[PDB]
Design a protein around this ligand. Structure first.
Ligand SMILES: [Mn+2]
Ligand SMILES: [Mn+2]
Ligand SMILES: [Mn+2]
Ligand SMILES: [Mn+2]
Ligand SMILES: [Mn+2]
Ligand SMILES: [Mn+2]
Lengths: 314, 314, 314
C-alpha cells in the first residue's frame, strides 16, 4: 500500500503562532526521504494553501471561525480524495484544529474507521464550553455525532458532518481535561486511558485494551490523530500546550509501533509541532525528530531492528 | 470535610539550611488558593513560630535535640487540636524531622491511623545508629513502639509516645537505607516497597498491596508523610537528600491520586522542600510545583480531569 | 566466592578515542574499594597491557583486525585463568569489542555458561555485514557458532572458537539494529527484549522470561556483558554509540539486581564507558557512577538496603 503526505501549515486554531511552520520543520528533518526508505510508497502532496477569510469576526467566543472552517474544508477534500485512491493519508500540522478536516475527509472514504487520539488534552470542548474560543481545542466536538446540535453553528463549519460516535474513539495521554470536556467525555462514556490509566496498566496493556476495544468486533481502519504535546515536554518540548507527566518517548513509540503491527493504519495526523516554541534549538530539534520517529514507527520502523525481505545479508 | 494548612518552617533536623523557607515557597506557589478550588474547605493556620532553645548541646551525636523536641511538641499540639475538630491536617515542611509532631498530634485524635511514608530514605535511624545526629533522619524511630527503649532518651523528646507499630506503616520509594536502618526494618519486618519493588510491580500494583496491607481489615485513617526527595531529583531537585532513580512524577501523582480515592486521607506532610537548594530557579520552581501538584492530587485533582457536580456545562 | 577485576583499556574496536581511559575512570570512581565493602573478596588484577600490532592494514572493511585480535587473545587468557581459580571475572572496558576475549576465556573454564547481553545494539554484525569495519560492533559474531564460516577469517582472530549458540544468549535493550544484524538475529531466532519488549512487559517480567528462558532447564553460570550505552544517554551519556529511549537507571539496576539474586554471576563486562565523551564533567561523572552502581548491584547492593549478617545493630 502507498502513503500520501499532506502539509497543513495552519495556525488559526491556536492563538499562538508558529505551528504552520510545522510541516516545513518536519520535512526539513528528512521526514519524507526517511519515510521513503520504508516498505511503503511515498508521494508528497505538498502543503495545502490556505486562504485567510478576511474579516473573521469571533463567532461569540470561537475565534477565527471561518478562517478555520475553510481551512479544514480544503483538507477534508484533499484527504478524502487521496484516501479514495487507497493511499494512506499523513497530515503534518499545524495545530490540532486541522484534525476535523483530516478525519472528515477520511470518514468519507472510510466511514467505518475508528480513532486513536494521542494527546494530553481531549480537545473535545464545544464552542459553548471552551474557555477560549480556540478551535484547536474543539476538534472532537465537530466530528462527534453525540455532540451534534449540542451547540450553535459556527461560520464555515457548515460542511462538517459528525462522522464518528464515542464508541469509535479512544484517547491516550489525557492529563489536562477541562471541567466541560471531562463532563462531556464521562457523560458520553468515551473510552480513554489518561496518564493514570497508563501508570496503572503500562502502555503495553493499554494498547491491548485500546485495540480489542476498538477492533474487537469489526477490523475497521484506524485513524491515528497524534498530538505532539501528548509526550512529556521532555521529548516534545516545542508545543503550545505542554503538560508535565506525559507519555515517554518509549511509550509514544510503542503506541505508533503497535498500531503499525495492526496493519490498519489508514490515516495519521502529526500535530502541534511548533518550531518557534523552543527554549533552545535542541528542543525544537528533539521534538521534530521524535515527531519523525513516531511517524516512521507507524510505518514499520521497529526498535527491534529492520531488514529487507528476501535478502541474505550474508 | 475541611482542610487545615499548618506551616512548619523548621530546619534543625537537617544540618543544611533553607527548608524553613519551604512552607513560604509553597504558599508563594499558590498552594492555598489552589487547594481552595477543590471540593474541600480551606483554612491557613499559618506557620507555627519556633523558639530556638538557647544552648542546645548535642546529646551525644544527636544535634539540636531540644530545639527539635520543642519544635515538634508545638506542632503535635496544633495538629492534634485541628484533627480534633475533624479537619484534615496538611503540614508544610520544613525538614522531615517535624514528622514526629505531625504524626504524634494526629495519633492522639486518631490513634488507629496508619502511615504511608514516601521517601528515598526510611528516616528510621535511632540516636544510636545515626551516623550523623541529624534528627530529620530519625522520625520513624521516636514514633515507633518497637523502638521504644531501644535507645537513650533525647532532651526535649520526653513528650513523645511511640504511637504506631511496624504493622501500621508502609514505606514507598526507599533506595538509600543505612545498614542500621535496614537492619531495624528487616528485623521488625516492616512492609515497604523500595524502588526495586516498584520496578518489579509497577506503582499501580504497589498501591494495591499498600492499601490492602494497611486497610485490608480495618479502614483506618491514613497519614501520608511525603518526603519530597522520594521522587527522582529530576522532579524534586531542591532537597538536602537527593537520590537517583526514584519515583517519577507520574508515579508520585498516582500514589497521592490513589490515596485521594481511598477517601481516608486524614493527615499529610509535605517535607524537605528546600528552596535555597536549586542549581537554577527552574529547579526550585519545578520542585515546589510538583510539591503543590502532589498535594492537590491528594485532594481530588485527577490527571483524568475534573468537573463540578450537578452542573451541566452544556 | 571471590571477585577478580581485570582492566581492558582498549579502544581499537571503536574508531573514536577515549574508552581505554575507561577502567581508569571507573577505578578512580572508587569501584574497587567499593566492591571491597560487599560480601565478596576482591583482587585487582590490573589493566592488561596491549601491544599495538604495528602496520595493521584493514582486512577489507574490518579495521585494526590484528590489533584487536591480539588484544582479545591476552584477555581471554587472563579471564580463562582467573575463572579457573573459581574467581568471578569483572572486566572494565574499553570498548565492547573486548567482549570476545572476556567471553572466550570464560567459555573455556565454563563452556555451559549463558550470556545476558545489555546493549542498545546487537554488536552481532559480521566482517561482511558491518557498514564500518569497527569490531566493537562485531563481538557476538566471532563468539557465535551459527555464524562460524558465515564470513571470512580476520587476521588475529584465528584463536577464536565460536563458544556459544543463539540459545545461550539473550539481548536486552536493543533499539538500534542494523538490517544485517536484524536479519541475522531474526534468522537464527535469538531471544531478546528490545525496548519495545521492555515497554510492553516491564523490566520485571522481562527478567523473569530472560531467566526462565536461559536457566529453565540447566542452571548454568551467567555471563553478563553490559554495554553502558544500553541505558538512556540520560544516565550513561559518556559513550560512542548513544541512542535515545533506553533502559532507565532503575531498569538497569533491576537487571543487575535480579542477576545478583540468581547467584549465578560468573562473568561481567562493564564496557563503552568513554570519559572523554562528556558535554560536561557531570555527564562523565554521572555515567561512571551508574557504571559503578550497576557493578555493585550485580554484587549484592540492593536498592532495598543492606546489613551485615549475624550482627545486631541494636
Ligand atoms: Mn490536541
Ligand atoms: Mn493537546
Ligand atoms: Mn525523610
Ligand atoms: Mn528523605
Ligand atoms: Mn556494544
Ligand atoms: Mn552498544
Amino acid at each position: 500500500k502507498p502513503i500520501e503526505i499532506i502539509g497543513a501549515p495552519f495556525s488559526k486554531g491556536q492563538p499562538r503562532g508558529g505551528v504552520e511552520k510545522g510541516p516545513a520543520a518536519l520535512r526539513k528533518a528528512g521526514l519524507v526521504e526517511k519515510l521513503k526508505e520504508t516498505e511503503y510508497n511515498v508521494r508528497d502532496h505538498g502543503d495545502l494553501a490556505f486562504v485567510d477569510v478576511p474579516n473573521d469576526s469571533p463567532f461569540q467566543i470561537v475565534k477565527n471561525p471561518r478562517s478555520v472552517g475553510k481551512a479544514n474544508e480544503q483538507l477534508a477534500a484533499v484527504v478524502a480524495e487521496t484516501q479514495k485512491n487507497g493511499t494512506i493519508s499523513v497530515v503534518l500540522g499545524g495545530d490540532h484544529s486541522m484534525a476535523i478536516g483530516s478525519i472528515s475527509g477520511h470518514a468519507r472514504v472510510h466511514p467505518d474507521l475508528c480513532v486513536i487520539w494521542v494527546d494530553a488534552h481531549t480537545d473535545i470542548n464545544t464552542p459553548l464550553t471552551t474557555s477560549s474560543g480556540n478551535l484547536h481545542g474543539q476538534p472532537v466536538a465537530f466530528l462527534l455525532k453525540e455532540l451534534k446540535g449540542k451547540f450553535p453553528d459556527v461560520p464555515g463549519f457548515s460542511w462538517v458532518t459528525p462522522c464518528i460516535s464515542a464508541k469509535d474513539i479512544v484517547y491516550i495521554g489525557l492529563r489536562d481535561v477541562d471541567p466541560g470536556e471531562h463532563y462531556i467525555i464521562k457523560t458520553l462514556g468515551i473510552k480513554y486511558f489518561s496518564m493514570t490509566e497508563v501508570d496503572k496498566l503500562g502502555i503495553g496493556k493499554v494498547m491491548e485494551e485500546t485495540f480489542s476495544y476498538l477492533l474487537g468486533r469489526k477490523k475497521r481502519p484506524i485513524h491515528l490523530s497524534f498530538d505532539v504535546d501528548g509526550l512529556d515536554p521532555v521529548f516534545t518540548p516545542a508545543t503550545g500546550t505542554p503538560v508535565v507527566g506525559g507519555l515517554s518517548y518509549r511509550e509514544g513509540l510503542y503506541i505508533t509501533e503497535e498500531i503499525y503491527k495492526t496493519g490498519l493504519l489508514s490515516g495519521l495526523d502529526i500535530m502541534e509541532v511548533n518550531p518557534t516554541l523552543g527554549k533552545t534549538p535542541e528542543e525544537v530539534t528533539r521534538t521534530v525528530n521524535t515527531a519523525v520517529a513516531l511517524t516512521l514507527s507507524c510505518f514499520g520502523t521497529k526498535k527491534e531492528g529492520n531488514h529487507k525481505p528476501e535478502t541474505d545479508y550474508l
